[PDB]
Amino acid sequence: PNLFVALYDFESRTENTLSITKGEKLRVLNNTENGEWCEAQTKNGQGWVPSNYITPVN
Secondary structure, three states: OOEEEEOOOEOOOOOOEOOEOOOOEEEEEEEOOOOOEEEEEEOOEEEEEEHHHEEEOO
16 A cells, blocks of 8 residues: 555655645655655655655555
């Protein structure tokens, strides 16, 4: 399973981060080795987001 929902708005100016909105659904493609960042996919594209900004959806 890899479906999540955003807990908060997140946006960074750094390249390769994805902007997400609270309540938006997303899928996680990859995980960093310390579990702190997730590579997310939404209708707005692909990019990294903090893992503590998302939570699973069954």
